[PDB]
């Protein structure tokens, strides 16, 4: 839904979970579960292996999602030095630097955090 998300093509997905080595036919419970695939690198994971909530699972499938290592800030479009401190939205899993949010954040939020895209919807 963001301009660069609609614009940028997506990598060929690798049909194996990077965490359990399972497939869409077998997760860690040996049950079927569709994979989520990174649009940048193509690596995949089961939502259960990613420890996603049901909301994250249903929302990221429709978005140009990036894995933990590919994730770039949705404002400044960079990974940055403090990439470890990039926040992940608890609704859409997009990443934001604290300084790149609106309003900018100086202290790490407690509890659930919803990004500026998801708060009005």
């Amino acid at each position: 839904s963001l301009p660069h998300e609609k614009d940028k093509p997506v990598a060929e997905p690798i049909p194996i979970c990077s965490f359990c080595l399972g497939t869409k036919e077998q997760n860690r419970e040996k049950k079927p579960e569709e994979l989520i695939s990174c649009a940048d690198c193509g690596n995949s994971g089961h939502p259960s292996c990613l420890k996603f909530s049901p909301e994250l699972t249903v929302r990221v499938k429709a978005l140009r999602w990036q894995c933990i290592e590919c994730k770039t800030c949705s404002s400044c479009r960079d990974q940055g030095k403090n990439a470890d401190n990039m926040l992940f939205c608890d609704s859409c899993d997009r990443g934001f630097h604290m300084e790149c949010c609106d309003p900018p954040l100086t202290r790490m939020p407690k509890g659930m955090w919803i990004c500026q895209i998801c708060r009005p919807r």
């Binding site: 690798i14 194996i16 990077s18 965490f19 359990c20 080595l21 994971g45 292996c49 990613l50 420890k51 933990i68 994730k71 990439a83 470890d84 401190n85 990039m86 926040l87 992940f88 608890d90 990443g95 790490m108 939020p109 407690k110 509890g111 659930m112 955090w113």
Partner: peptide, 25 residues
């Protein structure tokens, strides 16, 4: 809130890359 760091820790880390490639083949 979650960060790239907490997310990394939460998953427990990737399986070995070589083992992933053996399965893909």
């Amino acid at each position: 809130a979650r960060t790239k760091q907490t997310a990394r820790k939460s998953t427990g880390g990737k399986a070995p890359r070589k083992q992933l490639a053996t399965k893909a083949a």
